[PDB]
């Protein structure tokens, strides 16, 4: 669909923060949509990218890829401007075939979304302890 | 024994500090359970590892090993850095014919020695007995 | 400190036993102080040995070590003999710049861990943490 402002609510481990992302246009070379969070100093912004394989008559596999990166700014002595200290990434990839139907893809997506809110993942990501 | 948050109260030299540890799964390679300090960030926090071993063709007796290690953070950049680390480990070694009384006695004896004045003066201050 | 009789109270599983250890001197060849129980036969004693190792060019770390050795005897013959052994070993490592607060924290944390349900189940019942 055509890019639009995306407002996400109830983000955060507390469960109260919100995020508002603005479109940043498509890259013609590889067709990667982009969204960013409003703010000054474009180097300290939260970014989201969405990529989908273009429809073709002879295409075998359809690949959907999503990326997330959140930088943190630390002000240090000897510099007037803040700098990026570390990055927190994410990467979601889906892979279907030409003969798949809509229900399979919707089931996979909803299952992943529900898994990310299960206590197993809430424990394995927030606390970084392996599951055994 | 179920992995669970372990909280230690009234520890430290003064006797007021508390420490709460959170589970971090068990390693499938060597069966070592891990506990990590609640809150904090990785590579800047206290760790505890507990393992229990089975008799095999090399060793004919059980072996329980506990290792605790914790770093000190010093800030000069945005993020802290580790300056030094303090280690400590315990390794009991019982046998297959040992009863529960002996294991409990050894554990309680070790727990009670660390509160004795000898160990207090020989660990806090690094001076031996004379 | 100065070696003297060490008495340990509320020891054992039930928590009503006691134990008194009498000094047995400091070995000059390795600097290991020894505490033993009262008994005529050398092989049936309960021994506690503690040492502190000053840093050298090879190790450049402080190393405090404690050992425990508990034998059990039974008369199968005229006089009892040693059937099995139960061991326990502890060691600490510190750098030259460690403050006494960190060392006390490590000692008290290790003392408090041994009384938690996790260690009680792992050592007494030999149940691995899971």
């Amino acid at each position, epitope marked *: 669909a055509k890019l639009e402002t995306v407002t996400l609510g109830n983000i955060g481990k507390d469960g109260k923060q919100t995020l508002v992302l603005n479109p940043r246009g498509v890259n013609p070379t590889n067709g990667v949509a982009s969204l960013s969070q409003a703010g000054a100093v474009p180097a300290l912004e939260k970014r989201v990218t969405v990529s989908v394989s273009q429809p073709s008559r002879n295409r075998k596999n359809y690949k959907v890829q999503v990326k997330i990166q959140n930088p943190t700014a630390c002000t240090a002595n000897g510099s007037c401007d803040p700098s990026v200290t570390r990055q927190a990434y994410a990467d979601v990839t889906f892979s279907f075939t030409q003969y798949s139907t809509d229900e399979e893809r919707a089931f996979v997506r909803t299952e992943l979304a529900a898994l990310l809110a299960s206590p197993l993942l809430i424990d394995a990501i927030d606390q970084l302890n392996p599951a055994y | 024994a179920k992995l669970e948050t372990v909280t230690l*109260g009234n520890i430290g030299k003064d006797g007021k500090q508390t420490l709460v540890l959170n589970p971090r799964g068990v390693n499938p390679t060597n069966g070592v359970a891990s506990l990590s300090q609640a*809150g904090a960030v990785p590579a800047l926090e206290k760790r505890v590892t507990v393992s229990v071993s089975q008799p095999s063709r090399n060793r004919k007796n059980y072996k329980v090993q506990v290792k605790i290690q914790n770093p000190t953070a010093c800030t000069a950049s945005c993020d802290p850095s580790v300056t030094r680390q303090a280690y400590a480990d315990v390794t009991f070694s019982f046998t297959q014919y040992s009863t529960d009384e002996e294991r409990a006695f050894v554990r309680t004896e070790l727990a009670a020695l660390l509160a004795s004045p000898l160990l207090i003066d020989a660990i806090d201050q690094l001076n031996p007995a004379y | 400190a100065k070696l003297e009789t060490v008495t340990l109270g509320n020891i054992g599983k039930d928590g009503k036993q006691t134990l008194v250890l009498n000094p047995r001197g400091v070995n000059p060849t390795n600097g290991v102080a020894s505490l033993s129980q009262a008994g005529a036969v050398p092989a049936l004693e309960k021994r506690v040995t503690v040492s502190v190792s000053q840093p050298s060019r090879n190790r450049k770390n402080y190393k405090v070590q404690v050992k425990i050795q508990n034998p059990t005897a039974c008369t199968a013959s005229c006089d009892p003999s040693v059937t099995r052994q139960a061991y326990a070993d502890v060691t600490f490592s510190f750098t030259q710049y460690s403050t006494d607060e960190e060392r006390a924290f490590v000692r008290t944390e290790l003392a408090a861990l041994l009384a938690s349900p996790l260690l009680i189940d792992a050592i007494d019942q030999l149940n691995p943490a899971y």
Partner: antibody, heavy 117, light 103 residues
Framework: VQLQQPGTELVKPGASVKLSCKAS????????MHWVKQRPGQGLEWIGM????????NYNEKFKSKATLTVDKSSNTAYMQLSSLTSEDSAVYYC??????????????WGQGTSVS | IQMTQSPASLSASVGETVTITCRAS??????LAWYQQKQGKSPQLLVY???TLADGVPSRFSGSGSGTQYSLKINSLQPEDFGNYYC?????????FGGGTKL
């Protein structure tokens, strides 16, 4: 060392309630906080515990959906949000302060408790 | 681990000693506490290690037992000692309470 509680409150079915709390006389930072429900004539039940340092909750495997626990860092306050109230589970809710010293495991300084219709 | 109290109702009025027993489905290594609730609906703390005692307790209360069987003992019962008694364990996560017993 005492724990203030707002007192009895009345709410219509199918709503959510805050169950506020206040801690005084001690550092709120160090100690756990338990929540206990007592149905009149049915005995005590354990809801869960929370750690003020970082939100580290434990739950009964019951009340998972019904109860959620949060604490604000300053003002020494604890909360207990009940998502759905059919008013069938009308009871008195306490908030004890958990203590976990060596060979000393208990809940002391319980508090007055609040009744919810 | 499930805790249960055997009597669930006791009528001994004054003077005579009383006992309250407890059972656990698993082995808890003395991690047990006893609570007393009067008509004020705010429980107090007792014993807290199945053998020790709290600060305000007049020592007429005493507990014992090991393994999976525990008990509470009262000597020279006095009129103010009337109400409900609950027990719980501290060995695993649920920290389940007991059934309760009324005097």
């Amino acid at each position: 060392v005492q724990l203030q509680q707002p007192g009895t409150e009345l709410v219509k079915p199918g709503a959510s309630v805050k169950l506020s709390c206040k801690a005084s006389g001690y550092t709120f930072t160090n100690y756990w906080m338990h929540w206990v429900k007592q149905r009149p004539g049915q005995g005590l039940e354990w809801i869960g515990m929370i750690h003020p340092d970082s939100g580290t909750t434990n739950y009964n495997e019951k009340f998972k959906s019904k109860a959620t626990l949060t604490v604000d860092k300053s003002s020494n306050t604890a909360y207990m949000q009940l998502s759905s109230l059919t008013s069938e589970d009308s009871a008195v809710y306490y908030c004890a302060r958990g203590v976990f010293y060596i060979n000393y495991y208990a809940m002391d300084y319980w508090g007055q408790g609040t009744s919810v219709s | 681990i499930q805790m249960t109290q055997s009597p669930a109702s006791l009528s001994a009025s004054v003077g005579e000693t009383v006992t309250i027993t407890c059972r656990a489905s698993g082995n808890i290594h003395y991690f047990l506490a006893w609570y007393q609730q009067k008509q004020g609906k705010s429980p107090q703390l007792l014993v807290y290690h199945a053998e020790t005692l709290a600060d305000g307790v007049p020592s007429r209360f005493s507990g014992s037992g090991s393994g999976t069987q525990y008990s509470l003992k009262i000597n020279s019962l006095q009129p103010e000692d009337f109400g409900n008694y609950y027990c719980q364990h501290f060995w695993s996560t649920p920290y389940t309470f007991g059934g309760g017993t009324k005097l």
